[PDB]
Subunit: 271 residues, 2 copies
């Protein structure tokens, strides 16, 4: 079935061993950064589940590399656009993660300069939806600047429940070097974060991209019209309604371009 | 050989028919539009060879879609960082391409905001090289904002002679939706421009990324330490000197990450 194909493409297991998934994903981070010769990792810490989880895995990987006599560091970076409404949850995430370094880059001045230029050149106001993707891409630029300056790889937080819906900005938070959370459903991520000892406030925090000025902290599920638990059931191979399977198989086909390198006439996936 | 392998991977011919190449690449643009229900394209026009060629192909594609009773448009966009030294060549390119719409977005104020913020937050000035990658990624954001506002796809200008060296910014000019130039060597791109009747200045000038404030209009070959004739000979299957194969095969391996989606533990290419 199409559910099985998608499950397999996205690397989703029906059941997991949380402790061994943590070990395997820490080990992937160590293997990849050692293979490449990079000095460690950078990651934007939003206060949300996925970056809290990826951040803690990164910090565990660099601690293990130093325990072996290697040189590795993790830079966590706060990337508010001006005042972030849930700053307290991001600060809670930093207290849990205990990153080597805690940096901050406020993207508001960059985003405002871009938006103001846009209206100057075109005569058109940049709309809230397009400005939200500007913010996500400006966060990518900030993380790659830190990484370029410091010799680090940029972590991404994509996982199967965001992959299957294409619920990320293309070349924004989709732009990253390596992905420790690939294959995890939303609830499986949550299980890892709880096993790592995070408080409920972090592992049960409502998912949000928080990109819009007109509707700050808008829930992902409001935008999707589908819950993460339904997504997660689909991806783990449980039975879902026809409405759920139909809507997710259409969104998956519609967003394949975000899960492939740019299309050329030699590619067969878009045909 | 690894030469033959890289030729296959990058889709390169030793031998092409220029009229057929143009037909195929225009037909790809039209097919991708028809399949996806897309409304046209946006592309940064630099005054260099590659964006000249991709831009004229895009304009031929949208003219053919409209001749067939469809709806499509092409927005060409100038993306100077303040005063661009070869603005005249970009204007010559626009005059040849004859785009439906020619827009402009000066990226300087955005890049200066970002760079001033970086130094305020970190106490470090961005290297000229890191700031040049900020410029390339800001150009990606500009094209995606125009595309997002207007309902268009973003063209990229990657081709085999840039792909083999990884000579593009990751999620900068590498970040695009579809690629009309895939598989072309540099001299093959020149041959297609000659068939389309381009002004010779645009294919005789030196290739340049022109990203650096301190070394403006730096030639690609100065940065690479290898010429386009050498790259093209390699890619076209011609017997080359061992020094060229050594240099290119090392760059190709080192930059594989730029030609794959972000790495996960379920990928083996990187190990
Ligand atoms: Mg997320
Ligand atoms: Mg979030
Ligand atoms: Mg080029
Ligand atoms: Mg150029």
């Amino acid at each position: 079935s199409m559910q099985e194909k998608i499950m397999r493409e996205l690397h989703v297991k029906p059941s997991i061993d949380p402790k061994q998934e943590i070990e395997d994903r820490v080990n992937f981070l160590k293997q990849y950064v050692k293979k490449t010769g990079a000095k460690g990792f950078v990651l934007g810490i939003s206060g949300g589940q996925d970056s809290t989880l990826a951040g803690r895995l990164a910090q565990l990987a660099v601690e293990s590399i130093r325990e072996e006599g290697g040189d590795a560091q993790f830079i966590a970076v706060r990337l508010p656009h001006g005042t972030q409404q849930d700053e307290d949850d991001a600060q809670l995430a930093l207290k849990f993660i205990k990153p080597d370094k805690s940096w901050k880059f406020d993207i508001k001045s960059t985003v405002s300069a871009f938006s103001d230029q846009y209206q100057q050149e075109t005569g058109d106001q940049l709309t809230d939806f397009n400005k939200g993707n500007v913010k996500a891409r400006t966060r990518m630029i900030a993380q790659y600047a830190i990484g370029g300056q410091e010799g680090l790889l940029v972590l991404g937080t994509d996982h199967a429940a965001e992959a299957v819906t294409g619920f990320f900005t293309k070349y924004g938070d989709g732009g990253a070097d390596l992905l420790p959370l690939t294959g995890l459903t939303k609830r499986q991520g949550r299980t890892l974060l709880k096993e790592l000892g995070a408080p409920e406030r972090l592992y049960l925090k409502e998912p949000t991209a928080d990109l819009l000025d007109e509707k700050p902290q808008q829930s992902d599920e409001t935008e999707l019209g589908i819950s993460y638990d339904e997504i997660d059931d689909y991806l783990e191979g449980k039975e879902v309604s026809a409405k759920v399977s139909e809507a997710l198989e259409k969104r998956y086909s519609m967003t394949e371009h975000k899960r492939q390198v740019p299309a050329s006439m030699f590619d067969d996936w878009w045909k």
